[PDB]
Structure formats: C-alpha cells, structure tokens
UniProtKB/Swiss-Prot annotation, chains A, B, C, D, E, F:
Participates in replication and packaging of the viral genome. Plays a crucial role, together with NSP5, in the formation of virus factories (viroplasms), which are large inclusions in the host cytoplasm where replication intermediates are assembled and viral RNA replication takes place. Displays ssRNA binding, NTPase, RNA triphosphatase (RTPase) and ATP-independent helix-unwinding activities. The unwinding activity may prepare and organize plus-strand RNAs for packaging and replication by removing interfering secondary structures. Pfam families: Rota_NS35_C, Rota_NS35_N. It is an enzyme of class 3 (hydrolase). This is Non-structural protein 2. SUPFAM superfamilies: Rotavirus NSP2 fragment, C-terminal domain, Rotavirus NSP2 fragment, N-terminal domain. It is found in: Host cytoplasm. The keyword Transcription regulation does not apply.
Length: 307, 307, 307, 307, 307, 307
C-alpha cells in the first residue's frame, strides 16, 4: 500500500511530477529475474514503460498471491491517476520524493474517492479543490482531518446535523476488496470539526444502539468513528497499536484523537487511552477483554416509536 | 406529487430559477434525523446538494414504502428538468414561489410528456414553444386546456377529424406506474377546442360502444374525456369530488367542464352535474348507482361492417 | 382430416382392428414415386410399417406445405391412438371399413379430447366409457350430441346451471393449430340436453353481450353454440352450407339444430333457417349482410354491478 | 382459511371421509353464475368434480384478487391432502361435519408441515403418528399444544435444552406467502411442555436481546413465543384481540397462555394480561404505547464473548 | 476429520452398528447453546435425529468457517454411508467404539472411494469385498497397504507393469476440496506389493523426470509415492513429522516405509530416514534445504523419442 | 502469405502507394471465372474495387479451404493497413514493385504487431517510428534484427537484463491462428543486439530447463530463439532448410545466425551448423535424431529455491 505502487517521479520542467504505471509493465516486472541490488529501483519493462521496484511484488495479486491488489483492473489506473494529480499539485522536491512515495496508505479509501469523484451528483465531481484536499488527507499529505465533505465515501445510511454515517462498500471493490463475505464496516464522520451539542450526539448514540447493537464504536484516532463487529475489535486494536509504535519508533508525532467518551465503546476508550498514556501492547489489550461496569432510555424511546 | 418534490428555487441574476434534485440527495434525506421545526425546509445533504423538505418523505419509495415514486430512475431526473424549464420560463417572484411549488400535479402526465419530448417524430421534440405550453398546463400554470397537440400522450388507438384517443401507458411507466396489472385507461382529446359536428361525434361514440363497451366515458372537467373501467368510476368519482371541495375550501374557482352530454356516461353526467350545482358527496354518489332510464343503430352498423 | 390419415384396418382375430401410423412411415411415403393406380392404397415404407394412401399427401405439412398437420409431433400419435381405441370398440365390418375411414373429422376437436383425457382432474381421465363416447361423437360415429361432459374441451371461461362456455385453445395446438394469431373462438355446450329455463338463458345472453360484444353467436347445427368474431361469420356460413350440400348430395340426413332463437345472432338464424328450408347459397348469404331490425336491460344491469 | 377451502365430506362406508378439491374445479367455480341460495353449497363443475361453495371465492387469487391463495400450485394439493388424512383419522359425524370444515386455520402453518412431512430427515417423514398429531393441533382439532417436535417448522436458527427457535419461511411460500418483502418473523417452541430452569431461560433471553434486539417477544397464547418486529405488534395485538372476542361471542373457551413474564415483552404482557382480565380493545392497546419502566448483564457477556 | 463427524454408534441386535448423521441435524447442532460438560456427547436435534458432539463444530463450514467440510452436500451423506458399511462389517465392541470413531482420517480419500464405488466401470462397483477392504485401509482399520486395486482413485495419467499413477482430483471435490486453485498432486500406487524389476522402475522414473520435472517424489510412509510441487514439500514434511510424533506419544507403532531410494527425492529420503532414526524436527527439516550432491540418460531417451 | 494478398500498387503523385483490399472484393474474386492468362493480374470486382490476382485463391479460407486466412475479419483489414503504411514510407519504384509484393511473410507476426500497435500501453502505440521499423523487419524490408522493442509480441512470461521471453498467442489469432489446440510456442528476443554476460545467460538457460524442460531451444537464424515442443523440431528443421535452399536458388544471401551454442539445443545447433556448411537435407536431419553426448547445477538451484 506504499504510494510507490502506483507511480514514479520524473523531474520535468524543473519540478517533480508523478506518472501512473501501466499494469502490463507491472505484469512484466513480476516475471523478471532481478539482480539483488536492484530490488529497490524502478523496473524498465522496455515495451510498457517503467514499473515499480521488484521489492514490492507481494503487493500485486498473481495466481499464487491473493494478499495484493488487482492491478489489472481500470480502478488501479484511476487510483493511480488520483494519487498523481494530488502529488503533482504539491511540487515535491528531491529531498522529499522517497518519503512521500514510501508512505503506506489505504487503497480502499482511495478507490472510494474515485467512486465519489466520478459521480456527477457528488461535489468532488464538481470541485477539483475539495477532491485534491480529500485525496491529500487520504495519502497522509495534509493536516486537516477527514470530515463529511472530504470523506472517503460509501453509502449514507444515517445523517444528522452533526454526523454522517457511511456503509463501507469494501466487499464490492475492484482494486482491493475485503475477501471475507461476512465483513461489514461503517464510518461516522463529523459534518464540521466544531463542538457538537448533547442532543445531536444523543441521536447518533441512539441510532448505533438500535440499528447496530452488534457493533463496537471505535476510532483509529484520525477524527472519525469506525463501526465494527465486536468480533473484530481485536485486529483493529492490533493494527492501531502497531501504527502507534511505528510513529514512536519513526519519531512521527502520534496525535491520536480519542473522540467523545460518550460514544466510543468503553473497553476501546480504555485500550486506546492506555496506549496514549504510553503503555505496552499486552497491558493495553488487557482492557478490551476486561468486562467493566460503569444517556439512557434511548432504546426504549426508539422501540416505542416503532410500535 | 407536489412540485417541491423535484426542484428547489434559487434567486440568481435577480429572478427565480429552479433546480432539479439529485436522487442521492433525496436518498440521504430519507435517512436523516430531523428536528421537528425543520420538516418544512430544504435539506442539505452536504455531499449531493439540496434535497426536498423531509415532510415529503412518503412521496418516495423505499424498502418500506411503495406508494411513492421511483426517484432513483432517469425519468425522475428528466421529469424534474421538464418542470424546471417550464417554471424558469415563468420568472416567478418571491410572492408566488411557495404556491407554485406546493402545487400537486400528476407525475404520470409529466412522464408521458417526457416520452413525447424525447421522441424525434413528435412535434414536442421540434417545438420548445408547444413543449412549454404542454408542460405549463400539466403543472397547473396555464389557463389553456389540453388538446390533442398538447396532450400528455400515449398510444393513439383511434383518431377522427375532431378527436384523438390515447391508451395511457401507465403500467409501463418508470417513475410512478400503475401497480394493478389489470389496469387499463384511455383519454380522448379534442383536436381543436371549437364546436364539433354531430357526425364526427357519432364516429367517436360508435368506436367507444363497439371497441370499449366495458368502459365508462367520464371526465375530470379539464376538457378531456377519460375512458375507465366501470369498476373504477367509484374512485374517480371520489377524487374528483375531493378536488372540487379542495378548491371550494381553497377558494380556487372550480371550472368543471361537463363536456358533451351525448358522450359522457349518463350516471357520470348526473353525479358530476350534481356536484357543480353544489351538492353533497353522498347526495352525488347516489346517482352513480341509480340505474336510470333515458344516436342509435351504431353498434348494428359497425357490426355489419365487420361481417 | 379423413380418419384414414391416422390409421389403417387389420382383420385380426376375425374382426376389424385399427393401427396408428408411424410418422417416419408417413415421412417416407411423402418422398415416394407412386404409380398412379396406387394413389388410393396403403403404402409400405418397408422400414417403418404401413403408411396412408399417397392421395392424402396434402394433409401433412412439409417444407412446401403448411395447410396440413404436424404429423411428426407426439400429439399426432396420441390423436391416432384416441381414434383407434374408439374404432376398435366398434368392431367394424368389411362392409363399413372404407366409409368410417373416409370420414373427414376435426383434428383440433380430437387434440382437445387428448388434452382432456390425459388430465387427471378431468373425468375423461377416469372414465373409458365417457372418453369413448366423447370420441365417437367427435368422429361422427355416434348419434348423441356433444354436451358439457362430452365436450371437446378448452378453458372454461363461464359456467351456469344450463351452459358451460369454453375458450378454444386452437392457437396453442401441436397437431393443427390455427395460424392467424388474431384468432379467437369460443364454444358453449349445454350441461344437459333438456329444456332450459328463461332465467338461466338470460344469464348466458347477458355474459355474451357484456364480455363478448364483438362476437357473433352461431352454431354448426350439432347442438352447441360457437362464439366467433363478426369478421368471421362469412367463412363459417360458407363451410356450414357446403356441409349441408354435401349431405344432400351424399343423401346423408341433414339434421341441423338451429338452437334457441333468443341466443343465436339474428342474421345467422336467418341464413341458417333459410338453408334448412332448402335454399341457394347466394339466397342464404344475402341475409347475413341484410341489416335487419327486430331480453333487454341486461347490459345496464351488468354495467351497474361493475360500478 | 376455512377448512372448507380444501376439501368436501362424503359419507362412504358408513362414516365421514374428506376429499381434496381439484384446482380446475375451483377455477370453474370462480367463473360461475350462481343463484343466491346456492352460495353456501358445494359446486359441481361437471368436468372436474366438486368445488368449494362460491361464498368462499375471495379465498382464491385471480387476476383481480391477491388476498387469497395460489390454489393452482402443487402445494394447494399437498396441503389439502394433509388436511384430509388428519380429518379422516377422526371419523367425524354428521353432527360435527360443518363445524370442522367451517374452522379457519393458518395456511402457512399447514404449508410448513407439508415441507416437514416431505423431508426424509424430519421425523414427521418417518411417523404418521406425529404427523397426524402435528396437523390436528394445526387445524384446531387437538388439545395438545405445539411443541418443538410438533412445530409447524421453518429454519432452526437457535436451539437450547428447553427451546427451539425457527425462522418462518413465509416469504418463500408457494400457497400463501407473505407479500411484504421486508417481513421477518420467528417462532420459539418449548422442547417439552414442562417447567424450565432459570439458566436455560437466561440463554434464550440472551440470544433474543443480542441477535434480535429490534424484535418484540410476544405470543398468541397457544404455548409458543412469536418473534416479530416492533413495527408489527400493533396488528398482532389487533388480531389476537379479535380472536379473543370471537371465542367470547362464540362461547368458545379462551385459554390464553401468557407464557413466561421474564421473556414476553413488557407492554405485550400488559396488553395481553389486560385482555384476559376481560377488558376493552381500546383499554388494552393503551398499554402497548404506554412507555413503562420496570436478568441483566446478558448483553455485556455476549458482547465480551464476541470480542 | 474424525470418524465421529459422520456417524454414531448404536448397540442393536447385541452388536455395534453405525448411523450416518443428517446434515440438518448437524445444522441444528451448530446453532445450539451447549452446557460445557456436554461438548463431548452426541447432540439430539429433536427434529432431525442425533448429531455429532458440539466439540467438533469447527469441522463443518459455515458463513464464518471455511476450514471445515461442506456437510450439506450429497457427498457428505455418501461418505458417511461408505464409512458405516465398513464399520458395521467389523462388529466393533463397547471396548473399541470411541477409539475407532475418534480416529482422524482423510475426507478426500473417502470422497475418492465414493467416486470409484459409484462408477460401474470400476471394480469397486462390482465387488463389495474390495470396496470394504479399500475403505478399511482408508479409515485406518486394516493392516494391508493401499495398492492400485484398492487405491483412493483419481484420473490414471500413467500406467506400467508395476505402477499406476493417479491425478488427485481434489480441486473438484464436493465435500472438502482443495481451495488453492494452483494445487496439483499425484499419487503412485504399486500394482502389487511384491519386488519390482529395475526396468519397470526405470520407466516410472523416466516419466516423472520428463512429464513432472517440477515435482518432488515423496511418500507418507504408507506404501505409496506422492507427487507434489517442490514448493509444497515443506508442509508435507511438517505434517508427516507430526504424525510420526503423535504415534510416538500415542505409543502407536510407527511403521514408515521409505520406499525405493532410487525414486524418492534425495532430500526427502534424508529428512524421512532421519525421522525414522528418531530425530528432532529441526534436525530433520535441515536436510530438505541442504543442497546435496550424489539411472541416467533417461531424459535424453524420452527427448529423442519425441523428436 | 505474399504481400500481394493484402494490397495493390498505385502510382499516384509520381510515386508508388499501396492500397488495402476489400474483403468483399476478394470474396467476389473467389467466385470468378478467369481466363488463364489473367491469373496473375489484379482482379476488378466492379462493385468493391480491386482484388488480388486469382492465382492466390488458396490463400483465403472458404467452405472448402481452411489452409488460408480469415480475410473477412477486421484483423485482415488492420494487417493490410499495417503493411501499406510501412510500404508507403518506402516510396518503392516500378523496378521493385513486384518483388516487394511477391515476398512471402508471416501473417501471425503481423497480427501480433497490430495487437501491439493498438495497445496504448505499448510503445508501438506511441511511436510511428518504432512501429514502422518493427513492420519493415517483419515484411523483409529491413536489415535490422528483431529485438525486444521491435518484437512481434505476445505475452511476456519471463524477462531478464538481456532477454525477454514471449508466449506466442497464435491459437487465439483472428486472421490465421494455429489450428492444433495442443500447440504451444515461445520466442526469446535480445533486449539489445550487443554482447551478453555469462550470468545473464545462465538465468535464461535456468528458466528454460526448469519451466520448459519439454521444449527444444532453436532459432530460424534471424536473431531470436524459438521455444518449441521437441515433437515439432522436425517440421521446423524442414521449413528452415527449405528457406535456406530457396535463397541459395534465389541467390539471396543466406545469413543464418546460429546464436549462442550454450543455449541452442545440441542436435539443432548441429543440424543448423551443418546446413550453413552447405550440406544436404538428408545429411542434416540425420543429426537431429543422432543421440549425442557432450552450465550445470541450475535445476538443483531452482529446485532448492522452490522448496
């Protein structure tokens, strides 16, 4: 999921521009015999242009690899272009080139932006500005946080004055869909990164308790709630901790937003808050299984409405 | 069926213009939690633009509502545009905005115009003028009456020097088709709103008696005959009476054209004429079931032709 | 439509038995070069058994004949068997063999019996007795008249205490279906060949006037009403007159039952009654086009029910 | 849903036997003109045998009726046979004939038994005894209560030492399926009609709270829990009250089993318990909307398991 | 893969008989809430009969488990029957019941026997004797070794005077097929468990070198060669070592037949021979990666034939 | 396969231009009766333009000829255009016209170029220069040798610093595909026509021995390796010898590049080297069957990698 999997740099017109790879060039690369010291260099397919460094092979699916991406689809091309336009608007310098490209990002998030972008009803279709801003945050090249308007997208299943809830269409993705057919994940974005009233929070918590009782409300600390099956918070806990460590080992400032305590699942708030307080993985995961104790009457109200 | 279900007003360039809704914006609105005092205001979906007031929800079909319209079809879009072009040619003022938009109209009539408009053989395809005039009468913003050239359309099943008979293709509609598969309805329009000869009337009555003996000839008082199954005149009687009352309660001038007595079904002429004389619903419906008594030899002639 | 098209006689066990033809044997016959004096003899295909006399060739469809029957279907076989069982129960003698077999009958009527016979819900499926009686009348080897229980069949579209109305499924036949896709014909059979009350007649005439106004009520004189389009009574008039002549030329007693005058279409009753009075074809057909003059209130009642 | 819709009585061999109707006989009946005083007598189709009294017409679907059953399917036949075998094992007397046959029962319940019966893995397939007992309770001719082994059936979605939970496959029924595609209903049967431990009850309540939070736990008083959407308890409340009245007006002993108070939804227990105390409909329905107040920690446990 | 997954014991007629499970009974079991001390007891589904102990749940596929078997196929039933007939011919005693049933066997091997058995051209179809003997060795209840005639089966791709080579059709299995679409595995069985000539060995080694150069020739020590991709010998090495340990820990006599040294792949013969000499896993696997050194001219001969 | 099968010359603008034939014109020609002395002249179809000389008839497939090409496909047109653009860039003179056009070339090679050309990822799509150069060598009008960049194309199955290996997609060709479904052929092109290191040769020989052990490495002497089944080198040997003779009889300089001795199959190098030394066909083919004798350890290395 490194940006180097979709494009390569080219100083042209005294500046850094980025070019999408040709899937056939990637195809050729995957069949190449490469001298060891060249595993980290761009590959010349001769017939189809430059291709990613052979050290990234495992990122692409083959008849003996399904943990990668389906680079021979259109989406791959579209996702690559999406990345390039955003990177080109940055005018990166030799100094930063490898850093940007070495950055691992979410392919699903990017495919979702493509789907927004190519949709004439979606603002992103009408605003190169928002589109760029939305992509920039998605590829870690922006400080702003993802809000409703800049969201990766999906199917809106609930909306309020303060939040917007999306169903992540990952199962139906072309590039790198989720493989487990029993997967189901939602995302809640703030419409505005400003203070929210108790009332408009109550509405959100009521909808999650009623419509999604079998889901845990968590967050990856980037300003958005993630709705995941309770039987999945373990993995989520794992990956977020890794990412926390990485930045601690990478020196990268870990700015984890715990979000509203009233909304996040108890155990998660614990595991997470512990992590921030700079703790160990094992000490953290303890709290996810630790059956704890500490709005109300919501289910009853919604129940009564229905009746 | 209120015009507010397809568009919203926007004072731009010092005048009122109307914009079609995005189905996805409507989609989002239908999943929204709305504070009570906002049920009558346009909804901001954020991602897809403005959407109709949430007080109109029941106008759209969902997995738990089939009494609405299939707003996620193209037709919806087309019908919305149709309405907008017509409304824009009016240059409505703040004073009249809500009135026009609050007006309930027939969606089927509008889908039928779209079908005429997009048909290169149909004049409406070649005349923005007629098209506008045809739409204006359809959305109650014109005084002229619907005649053959401005008809909602359908399949011409009979034509004369004075009339044109159309089969209403409602079953095969995209936006809001009739659901009962045993439905069948025709419409007869005058080619010209001028006096008609006895002869050219005789031809029309002969075709209705022969080809449509199981149909009642009625009218909704807007200048056109409606051919409906006898097992349906009850509902028709109901809705036309309501509309009569509404305008009496709304102060709106009720100008009901009873049309030719020689053509309209006896009982209907009664029920209707009674209504005009300002009577009660119950007093009116009496006459539809009251087996009464009072051209001829027509069936015999047509019968002889056949043989 | 001669019985000789489905079977051949074989004196075995000192009596006449009849055998169904093999379609392939018929197939071979149709490709045979036959000496003139053999056109009226059964054909030996050698490989597939006996086949009908080559003088009947035009009775079978080929790539250059569609006025015949589709003898290569199962139905052909079934219809042949049907005929044989009935003929075998007669124990025909040398004296009568050729007469029975030379008799022209209706193939559609026979296919309809097969459909009744093979239907477990139909009595004919449970009674070899009725089945035989029904077939015997169909192949002109019985004096009884076709009544509801012995009817050729079809879809019951109306039933009363005295009559049963059937839709003739000829379009969907396998052996010799009607080719004109705009064909539509009904048949009314008496449930009992006894006197019928005025009331139970009124019900029948009311259903024909309401539900079938574009149909003429006639009869071929064999005791059953035939409901045919007015644009078809001409042909019907023709064929029935021919059949009348044939029997007059054949000496065969013409017993034509005009049926109830109150039900039969006026002009038809005339044309027919004239025919019986022993008249000319031209003198007879005159009356079908002669726009004449002489129960009531029926349509109004049915109309009122509907409303 | 009266038993008279599937069979008719025939005293043969000095006893009452019951015979299934032929769908074509029903078909004919539906097209019959019947003298008023005969609306309550069995109809003779002549060709297809006896048919139900024409007063039951609305029980069968036609091109202008979808509130009936699809009698032209196999299921109809199967369901009819099912009923007959059970009724025949009773040896009903002239005295009781009309009572048994006039009894309204659930067609869906009967189709479900057919599905059990014809399933070689299901005991009912191997035991004419249980099958009969299961049918007898289903057609109100038995005092025993429906338990797991005699259940109408469906898909087992949960099972315990004391209960068995079934998904009602009504949407996929042939004879009289539910038409609303958003329908979903479950049924919980006791494996034994004996006292149940608190523990094995706790398991049942935990599964309903976790897996079916959007469902109300009610009962029709016949010894089994019914799991229905909260947006449906209104209708359920209505029909059960009617049935309560009917038996009070019919003098039929109303033995309504309120079932465990710990399991039944609060408001329902109220509405129901009120009904038994002999109260009014309006006084009863009050309690369904009356947001009340009065095991625990279950959701938390199940939540923890998942994690 | 324990025999307890397909059947249960029943002392009937003073002896032990085994019965196949009903898939629906297994289905119910998988939805059951079971008290801990009952995880090792047979489950009573009530409606579908006995089912396997809930402790084996993971052996069956569900919407959240693909590492099990597709028990709802016919094959499951067939494989179960296959096992039962064989076990019933043993007349097992209370003393041995649990041992036999606790035995883990290969499901693919059993599905392959079913395919042989149901094939009229295959001897196993004509000999209950061989069939039983073939099954008995497959479920570890026989001392004889699998030879060509008693082979699990597959597609014969090569045959000699001494051996028979089969392609394992695992990908196309119904019950528990291989999931990796790039899987390919062969099996070589001796036609007779007697000494083989050098010549008829040479033919076998020549066919493996030419036609299967990218395959390693190994064995699981039960008397048959297994042809597997070199990129798979690692797993094979793992599982065979485990099985070796198990029997050492289980006290079960480990009789591993290294087979011909001239045929088995060098490294495998090492790894294996080491294992027998009673060594450690790590010490054993060393030799599989240890690029060693020590018939000929075979490829050249085959190459020349082709040309 | 003569260039005259796709185009005809036309001196226009004082120079030679070439025009593609219309398939329908060819179609007409194939049905023409031609006077003998006209078999070598272009044919005038009158309606579809000029067509090839009737002496080439056997080059086109008909309902009684499958040894030709499917000229009624698009590919035919495309391949013709491809040839014309290349020939037009030559500005051929009257003196050379017939020579160029009489030249027999490979149609498959040309279809492959079309596939490269029309592929936006392929350089040939972006460079009229390379495209022309690639075509020119393919139609024998260039001295340069085919290298990776100018290759006919196919699916890249292996690539190195010095070579590129392609799978010839001949089976799936439109114009003149290979008919034997068991056909399989590869081509190895040098990326640069410069000296290659021993190492980068070793990689190529290792991939051929491992992945293609059942294939002979040969060459047609034009600078590229051809990978063919050993059961096919006979034909290859035949055709290359013919071509050698032709040029010796045609006086055309035979410049046959034997390519690397370390890579070419032994026997082939012999047969070929013999041919060059100017020998007889029979003397040459001897060596292909003569089982001879004279890098290593490669298979073992690759084998070890896999494990």
């Amino acid at each position: 999921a490194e940006l180097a999997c979709f494009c390569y740099p080219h100083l042209e017109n005294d500046s850094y521009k980025f070019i999408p790879f040709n899937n056939l060039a990637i195809k050729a690369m995957l069949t190449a015999k490469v001298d060891k010291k060249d595993m980290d260099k761009f590959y010349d397919s001769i017939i189809y242009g430059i291709a990613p460094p052979p050290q990234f092979k495992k990122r692409y699916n083959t008849n003996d690899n399904s943990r990668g991406m389906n680079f021979e689809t259109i989406m791959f091309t579209k996702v690559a272009m999406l990345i390039c336009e955003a990177l080109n608007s940055l005018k990166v310098t030799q100094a930063n080139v490898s850093n940007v490209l070495s950055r691992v990002v979410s392919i699903r998030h990017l495919e979702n932006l493509v789907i927004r972008k190519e949709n004439p009803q979606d603002i992103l279709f009408h605003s190169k500005d928002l589109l760029l801003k939305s992509t920039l945050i998605a590829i870690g090249q922006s400080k702003e946080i993802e809000t409703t308007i800049t969201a990766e997208g999906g199917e809106i299943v609930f909306q309020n004055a303060a939040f917007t809830m999306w169903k992540l269409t990952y199962l139906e993705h072309q590039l790198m869909p989720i493989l487990d057919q029993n997967f189901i994940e939602y995302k809640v974005t703030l419409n505005e990164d400003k203070p929210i009233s108790d009332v408009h929070v109550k509405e959100l918590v009521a909808e999650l308790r009623w419509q999604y009782n079998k889901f845990a409300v968590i967050t990856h600390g980037k300003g958005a709630y993630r709705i995941v099956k309770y039987s999945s918070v373990a993995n989520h806990a794992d990956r977020v901790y890794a990412t926390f460590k990485s930045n601690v080992k990478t020196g990268v400032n870990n700015d984890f937003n715990l979000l509203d305590q009233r909304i996040i699942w108890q155990n998660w708030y614990a595991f997470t808050s512990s992590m921030k307080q700079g703790n160990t993985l094992d000490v953290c995961k303890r709290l996810l299984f630790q059956k704890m104790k500490p709005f109300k009457g919501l289910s009853t109200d919604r129940k009564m409405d229905e009746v």
